[model samples]
Target chain A: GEIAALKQEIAALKKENAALKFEIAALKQGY
Target chain B: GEIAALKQEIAALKKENAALKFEIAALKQGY
Candidate 1:
């Protein structure tokens, strides 16, 4: 059960990381 | 050019994070 939960958390982290990447690109583009 | 490089770096980081997640799952599964 804990492992499953950890996977879910990791999934959320991956999404956040992707969002950060997008924001970084936008910042670089001066948007 | 630098911004493009940064994006590439972020891509590498994302791949690393994905691999780490897989490893963590494997460890939890006692593999």
Candidate 2:
């Protein structure tokens, strides 16, 4: 499913993206 | 947050940690 595809989070992108996305999502989600 | 490990360095315990919610996402858009 596309949701599964959206859920992968490859190893290469993992390190860099984690903090940034989390911060962004957190901000967006207002958590 | 303590890895930021314990004792800040000197007396730290060795442990495996990960940032998993990191690195995956967004499949619906071409952007």
Candidate 3:
């Protein structure tokens, strides 16, 4: 993902990663 | 794939959309 599909994929992956981190934090907080 | 996509999506998006930044910058360039 660098120009078109890949670029979007990268963005999505980054977004997903953030989401996962948030989820992990939430889980760690016992929520 | 391996996240090889995207161009100025993060930094640019963070600034108010990369596409917009580029567009604005280009317009400002006036050339």
Candidate 4:
């Protein structure tokens, strides 16, 4: 159960990374 | 780091934030 809690954190972190990457790409294009 | 995968991900992502911040700042100045 302890590790399960961290699974949520990791999944959320992964999604954040995706959003960050999309935002970064937008910024690169002069957004 | 014992968290070889996650530590690397966290450290790298933290760095992306720094680089992204710098880039955004420059874009504000018409980079």
What is candidate 2's lDDT per residue for A1-31, written digit by digit as tens? 5333333323334444546556556654652
Q: What is the C-alpha local distance difference test score of each model?
A: 0.59, 0.36, 0.51, 0.65
Q: Which regions of candidate 4 fall more than 4 Å away from where they truly are?
A: B1-31
Candidate that would win on TM-score: 4
Better of 3 and 4 by lDDT: 4
* Residue A19 lDDT, candidate 3, scale 0-100: 60
lDDT of 2: 0.36
In terms of lDDT, the poorest run of 10 residues in model 4 chain A is: A1-10
lDDT of 4 by residue, B1-31 (tens): 3356655666676676667666666776774
RMSD of each: 17.5, 15.1, 14.1, 3.4
Candidate 3: tens digits of C-alpha lDDT, residues A1-31: 2356756655775675556555545554662
The ten-residue window of minimal lDDT in model 3 chain B covers: B1-10
| Candidate 3 local lDDT, B1-31, one digit each (tens) | 2332244444444554444445545544663
Ranking by DockQ: 4, 3, 1, 2
Which consecutive 10 residues in model 1 chain B have the weakest lDDT in total? Answer: B22-31
Q: Could you tell me which residue pairs clash in candidate 3?
A: A1-A6, A1-A7, A1-B4, A1-B5, A2-A7, A2-B4, A2-B5, A6-B5, A7-B5, A7-B6
| Candidate 1: tens digits of C-alpha lDDT, residues B1-31 | 6555555655666686666556555554663
C-alpha lDDT (0 to 100) for residue A21 of candidate 2: 59
What DockQ does predicted model 2 obtain? Answer: 0.02
Could you tell me the lDDT of residue B13 within candidate 2? Answer: 14
Q: What lDDT tens digits, residue by residue, belong to model 4 across residues A1-31?
A: 5355545556776676677667767877875
Model 1's CAPRI class is: incorrect
Model 4, residue B22: displacement in angstroms?
6.0
Best by lDDT: 4
